[PDB]
Design a protein around this ligand. Structure first.
Ligand SMILES: *[C@@H](C)/C=N/c1c(NC[C@H](O)[C@H](O)[C@H](O)CO)[nH]c(=O)[nH]c1=O
Ligand SMILES: *[C@@H]1O[C@H](CO)[C@@H](O)[C@H](O)[C@H]1NC(C)=O
Lengths: 222, 205, 97, 265
């Protein structure tokens, strides 16, 4: 199993940036890690590969001294370092490893954002609570709670609708990431039946610029 | 070594079958063909594997019609579902018999976008509901067939109106929610145009 | 549907003038089975040429192998005449050192 | 990976290339069984096949093959009755298994008309796959006899795996990797002037081999041209890989669990 903790990484023009990829089960010292780039409206292409012994390999069309790969045995994670980042590097990066013993596993994916100047504003997603009317909760006997997120630039977002006990509920429904002035805004909702109408549902949103570093939590009363 | 995918976007109804023709150009004697399903949430998932000297692979709902001389790897789905709406990838790999040392590189393709439209279902009456918080007001529509709906909201003074994104409900119909910023808080009415009938917000109230 | 044969002329061991080797005329990817193969030596066909049995392949096509002990030389030129239904003209593939 | 496949040929009218019915069995790449319409008897093709098997086994399958030869003539006349084709044509059959090195089971049965997929069998659904309207009539004719189709499914699952595992034990000269390749790099030219690095490897067994070219420490993607794994004639195989030279190039070989490295002199 492969998992990339970073969902998005916003880096300033012509600067160094590190991308995370953590392994599960098998150790990095025994296997080889591969790195891929998924360009918008293009093909998924290979970048760099680090062998189990320690040797590094690349692809035709990569300059000498642009990408760096390291796998620490203490932490058991693979990291890709991108030097002198340009506009042509804006893509969803994936880390790969060969499964037992035919298929090839792939990471969650990390989209790269490149800007001219540094972010001089709070790009944290602003939460807005939306409670349904009495007419929908009484006649249909099913409530519909909506969550409104705005004032965020990386645009790479993940919306989860749970309960008091952390478990992903089927039927979560979301729209599209709308572009306003220079920032972005996205909305999502959940329709729960009479069985879980008394249960207090909680909505969790994953983003790079979340408060205190940890994931953002939004509470909805029943 | 290159993988070509002519199909860019394919629209197919539920329960039916869909064939995705993939072409490849390579030189090795022994090789593998990998098919991947990339979810809109950036989730890459393995589906099936096809060997050069191997017989046409079948992994449940997924089956590949392998043409060796023609160099075609067409993947056919037995029965279509709701969760099938994702981007499909066609990959090319080598057949080596040693440790996985950094050389086993997959040659991917352009990709094929699949948008599964709902199956032949009867017409359902649309129910309009409303919700608000300060300046932003949202209107919800549930259980209606087909996608043809002219949803509108009447306001005294409007600042910005956002386009409504339509999503498929697991019940067997469509679901649409529209919102925007308004100066008025206690005066909001909606009129819809679906199945030649108009339903107001006061009908349920 | 008809299939044309893929003729491949080579040697069992690496080329060296003096030491005895085996001449191989490997045909593959042909349909139907009826074929006429004759190993040539400076234009003249060799009287005694040993051959493998008509082998079957997974793609419904057939493949054969013709072998005979020969002494390679810089002056002498070798080839093999192949005659099939698809070949309107009996294709002659020249062997390269 | 190990495999056991049995083939059947059915030529309508014979010419200089006699006979009409030929049935040859294979274990991975080597022939094991031999049967022809000239001499209606099951003959061995491998030295290890002649031994370890009683004369009763050879005699039992002879009468079975004599019956399948008679069935093939009936299927040929039926094909000439349905289709408008009349003269000299080919009717093929292929039954086989692929026992994987991990322990995965894969069974298959196929019928062909003039080197084209006529009817393909599906064991999970217990029904045939028709290619067109003409193939649909024979599909219905075979689908009627339920117990006949169930025998084909039962044979591919338990009997076929047991037959292949018995032959692999009988042939030690199949499991052996006692034949390493001879990788030698040679500079070749076709027309003046052209330069190419030919990484020629010969005298290897099993035919399963991997070759690649590496520039300093990077594989030459979408440039390397590959040859064919050809039989030498003395139970060994040969293969090559060429790359266009320009003013470090290393050839990498993978055979018998040994990684061979060759630097350009
Ligand atoms: C001797 C072992 C030769 N057998 C042979 C077979 N055997 C497989 C199987 O018994 C047969 O195909 C049945 O008809 C399946 O229902 N098949 C073949 O084509 N040729 C042979 O020489
Ligand atoms: C309205 O939204 C704000 C956040 O913007 C929240 O603090 C408040 O509780 C919400 N009120 C209701 C009734 O949803």
């Amino acid at each position: 199993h492969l998992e990339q903790p970073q969902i998005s990484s916003t880096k300033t023009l012509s600067k160094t940036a590190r991308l995370e990829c953590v392994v599960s089960g098998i150790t990095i010292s025994a296997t080889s890690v591969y790195w891929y780039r998924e360009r918008p409206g293009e093909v998924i292409q290979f970048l760099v590969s680090i062998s189990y012994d320690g040797t590094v390999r690349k692809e035709s069309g990569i300059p000498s001294g642009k990408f760096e790969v390291d796998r620490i045995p203490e932490t058991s994670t693979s990291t890709l370092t991108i030097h002198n980042v340009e506009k042509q590097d804006i893509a969803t990066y994936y880390c790969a490893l060969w499964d037992r013993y035919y298929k090839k596993l792939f990471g969650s994916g990390t989209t790269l954002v490149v800007t001219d100047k540094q972010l001089d504003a709070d790009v944290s997603p602003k939460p807005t609570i939306f409670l349904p009317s009495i007419a929908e909760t009484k006649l249909q006997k099913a409530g519909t709670y909506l969550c409104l997120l705005e004032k965020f630039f990386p645009d790479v977002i993940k919306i989860h609708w749970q309960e008091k006990k952390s478990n992903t509920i089927l039927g979560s429904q979301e729209g599209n990431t709308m572009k306003t002035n220079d920032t972005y805004m996205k909305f999502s909702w959940l329709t729960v039946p009479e069985e879980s109408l008394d249960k207090e549902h909680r909505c969790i949103v994953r983003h790079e610029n979340n408060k205190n570093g940890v994931d953002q939590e939004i509470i909805f009363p029943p | 070594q290159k993988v070509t995918q002519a199909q860019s976007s394919v629209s197919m109804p539920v329960r039916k079958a869909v064939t995705l023709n993939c072409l490849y150009e390579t030189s090795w004697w022994s090789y593998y063909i990998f098919w991947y399903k990339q979810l809109p949430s950036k989730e890459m998932i393995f589906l099936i594997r096809q060997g050069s000297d191997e017989q046409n692979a079948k992994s449940g709902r997924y089956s590949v019609n392998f043409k060796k001389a023609a160099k075609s790897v067409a993947l056919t789905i037995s029965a279509l579902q709701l969760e099938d709406s994702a981007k499909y990838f066609c990959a090319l790999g080598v057949r080596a018999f040693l440790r996985d040392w950094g050389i086993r590189v997959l040659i991917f393709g352009k990709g094929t976008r699949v948008t599964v439209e709902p199956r032949s279902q009867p017409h359902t009456k649309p129910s309009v509901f409303v919700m608000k918080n300060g300046t932003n007001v949202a209107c919800l529509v549930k259980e209606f067939y087909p996608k043809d709906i002219r949803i509108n909201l009447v306001s005294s003074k409007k600042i910005t109106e956002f386009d409504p994104a339509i999503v498929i409900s697991p019940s067997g119909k469509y679901n649409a929610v529209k919102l925007g910023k308004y100066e008025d808080s206690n005066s909001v009415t909606c009129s819809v145009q679906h199945d030649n009938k108009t339903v107001h917000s006061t009908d349920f109230e | 549907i008809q299939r044309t044969p893929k003729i491949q002329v080579y040697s069992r061991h690496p080329a060296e003038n003096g030491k005895s080797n085996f001449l191989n005329c490997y045909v593959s990817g042909f349909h139907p089975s009826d074929i006429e193969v004759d190993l040539l030596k400076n234009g003249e066909r060799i009287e005694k040429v040993e051959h493998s049995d008509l082998s079957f392949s997974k793609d419904w096509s057939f493949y054969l192998l013709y072998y005979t002990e020969f002494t390679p030389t810089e002056k002498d030129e070798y080839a093999c005449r192949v005659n099939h239904v698809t070949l309107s003209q009996p294709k002659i593939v020249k062997w390269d050192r | 990976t190990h495999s056991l496949r049995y083939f059947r040929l059915g030529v309508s009218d014979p010419i200089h290339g006699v006979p009409e019915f030929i049935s040859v069995g294979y274990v991975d790449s080597h022939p094991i069984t031999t049967y022809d319409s000239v001499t209606r008897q099951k003959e061995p093709r491998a030295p290890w096949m002649a031994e370890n098997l009683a004369p009763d086994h050879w005699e039992r399958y002879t009468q079975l093959l004599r019956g399948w030869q008679q069935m093939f003539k009936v299927e040929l006349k039926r094909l000439q009755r349905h289709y408008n084709h009349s003269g000299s044509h080919t009717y093929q059959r292929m039954i086989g298994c692929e026992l994987l090195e991990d322990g995965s089971t894969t069974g298959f049965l196929q019928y062909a008309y003039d080197g084209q997929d006529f009817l393909i069998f599906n064991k999970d659904t217990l029904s045939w796959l028709a290619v067109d309207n003409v193939a649909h009539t024979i599909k219905q004719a075979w689908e009627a006899n339920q117990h006949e189709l169930l025998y084909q499914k039962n044979w591919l699952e338990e009997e076929c795996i047991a037959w292949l595992k018995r032959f692999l034990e009988y042939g030690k000269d199949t499991l052996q990797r006692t034949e390493p390749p001879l990788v030698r790099v040679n500079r070749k030219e076709t027309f003046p002037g052209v330069t190419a690095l030919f990484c020629k490897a010969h005298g290897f067994y099993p035919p399963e081999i991997y070759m690649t070219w590496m520039k300093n420490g990077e594989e030459i993607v979408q440039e390397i041209d590959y040859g064919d794994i050809l039989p030498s004639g003395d139970g060994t195989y040969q293969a090559w890989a060429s790359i266009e030279l320009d003013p470090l190039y290393s050839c990498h070989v993978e055979h018998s669990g040994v990684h061979m490295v060759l630097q350009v002199p």
